[PDB]
Amino acid sequence: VNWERYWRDVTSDWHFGSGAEMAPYLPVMLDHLAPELPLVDLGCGDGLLTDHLARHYPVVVGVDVSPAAIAAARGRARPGLSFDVLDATDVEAAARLRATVGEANVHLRGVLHAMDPADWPAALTTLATLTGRRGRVFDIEITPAFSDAVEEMLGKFAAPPPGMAAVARSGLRPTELDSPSLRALYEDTGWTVVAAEELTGRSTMRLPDGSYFEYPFTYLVAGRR
Amino acid sequence: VNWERYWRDVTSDATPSPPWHFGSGAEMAPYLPVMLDHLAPELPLVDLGCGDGLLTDHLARHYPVVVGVDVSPAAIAAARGRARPGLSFDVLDATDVEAAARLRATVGEANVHLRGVLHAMDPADWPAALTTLATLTGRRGRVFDIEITPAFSDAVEEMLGKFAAPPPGMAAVARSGLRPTELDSPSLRALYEDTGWTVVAAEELTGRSTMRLPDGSYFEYPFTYLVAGRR
Ligand SMILES: Nc1ncnc2c1ncn2[C@@H]1O[C@H](CSCC[C@H](N)C(=O)O)[C@@H](O)[C@H]1O
Numbered sequence A: 001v002n003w004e005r006y007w008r009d010v011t012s013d014w015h016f017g018s019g020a021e022m023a024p025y026l027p028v029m030l031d032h033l034a035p036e037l038p039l040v041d042l043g044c045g046d047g048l049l050t051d052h053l054a055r056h057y058p059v060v061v062g063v064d065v066s067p068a069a070i071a072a073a074r075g076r077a078r079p080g081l082s083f084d085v086l087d088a089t090d091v092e093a094a095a096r097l098r099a100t101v102g103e104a105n106v107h108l109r110g111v112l113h114a115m116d117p118a119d120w121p122a123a124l125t126t127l128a129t130l131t132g133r134r135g136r137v138f139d140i141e142i143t144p145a146f147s148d149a150v151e152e153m154l155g156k157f158a159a160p161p162p163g164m165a166a167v168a169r170s171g172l173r174p175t176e177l178d179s180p181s182l183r184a185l186y187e188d189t190g191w192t193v194v195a196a197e198e199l200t201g202r203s204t205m206r207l208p209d210g211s212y213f214e215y216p217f218t219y220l221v222a223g224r225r
Numbered sequence B: 001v002n003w004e005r006y007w008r009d010v011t012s013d014a015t016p017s018p019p020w021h022f023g024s025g026a027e028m029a030p031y032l033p034v035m036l037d038h039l040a041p042e043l044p045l046v047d048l049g050c051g052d053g054l055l056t057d058h059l060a061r062h063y064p065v066v067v068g069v070d071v072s073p074a075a076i077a078a079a080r081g082r083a084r085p086g087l088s089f090d091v092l093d094a095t096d097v098e099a100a101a102r103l104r105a106t107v108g109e110a111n112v113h114l115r116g117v118l119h120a121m122d123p124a125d126w127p128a129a130l131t132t133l134a135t136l137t138g139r140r141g142r143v144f145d146i147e148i149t150p151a152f153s154d155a156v157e158e159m160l161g162k163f164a165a166p167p168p169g170m171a172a173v174a175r176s177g178l179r180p181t182e183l184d185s186p187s188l189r190a191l192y193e194d195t196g197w198t199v200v201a202a203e204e205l206t207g208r209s210t211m212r213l214p215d216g217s218y219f220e221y222p223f224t225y226l227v228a229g230r231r
């Protein structure tokens, strides 16, 4: 609903940046996600990354809660790449997709921290409906360490007035899922974690102390039984 | 989010730095005039979420009797270093209404200063916190509450885009890493008004960094505040 707003304002604005620059986890995906299966990009947004995943996967469906995102994404449609609206909370939509495309792998980039922790049960049921017993999910999320990285950065290049560092902290509300809490979310719902590492994305922009801001991510790959 | 962990790390260093080290008054508590004008002058002051005790040392040089309280034992262990006659530091969880009542019986009816405390806790604990506030203030007492605006996330986003840009592809991913504050000026007003508070004084304050970004721009920490009385 607020994500519908965000994609209307972003789309007021083929070729590909570099290699594994877009998807540095790609080798992990090909290693753990059967390529013979179709791939759903849950929370595909404007389809940029979905397009780049398609270079490697022959049957790809991006889906997203926002109709703006899908409409913009739909621009990139081709044979073997397709886009559709789907709320990860709407298990009956997930069922309808599963029965269309078949058992499928599912890649999420940023989706769990994109929604209320109360919608996670439904989202994970959706993932389970899409995967059946042959499909696997690749899920990557920005860690609570991101807020620690913004706190540090405000700390030295935009310090709050004196004695106001902890009030600044109060406004820096972290994400819920680190490495262990991502693994607990999948395991407590009946998933087998096949793989699970961390991953950092540096900024090409040089901060005054010759440091580079680091965006901290964490991913796992999971399957049912 | 984990306030004992924060304060043990910050308190791991420091001999507490008197307030005159960091500023010459005005900059620590720009809002003090709004407090002198609308709070009752005779009542003791509670600093809810007092932390290491810096701002409460400052306030206790304008207010005869002041008690700073915080969830975090570490925070209070450090704050107690600043202790002197008329300046007092205790462990109080704003949730724990029983503890809030025990203070009210000891201290008497009080004014309460809150900095950041409502966004420092879970919206689920807000009804309990407002009850703690009603218990300390009684009839005569009032609250000054100041909170970092929801548009802080927007300021951080602007900063990051300009000097710490995300990897190409990661812009939307990084917007989700921004868990937004929920009390803007209209929302902080409602929370107090829908729980039987009268709002005497409500405005917005912008507290600026002295550090100059490479842009030439200065970082603007967006605040909002109000003074509330039990109706
Ligand atoms: N319940 C839900 N179901 C599906 N998508 C959702 C959702 N809640 C949020 N989203 C989507 O999740 C995305 C989060 S950020 C965009 C992620 C995208 N794969 C990328 O890296 O570019 C947004 O597109 C948002 O619209």
Ligand SMILES: Nc1ncnc2c1ncn2[C@@H]1O[C@H](CSCC[C@H](N)C(=O)O)[C@@H](O)[C@H]1O
Pocket: A163, A164, A166, A167, A169, A170, B003, B048, B049, B050, B051, B052, B055, B069, B070, B071, B072, B075, B092, B093, B094, B095, B114, B115, B116, B117, B120, B121
């Ligand atoms: N439930 C709760 N009850 C009491 N204090 C709390 C609390 N949750 C958070 N706090 C405290 O509220 C503060 C929020 S930020 C710190 C503001 C403080 N006046 C200062 O300038 O340092 C922290 O000190 C934190 O320890």
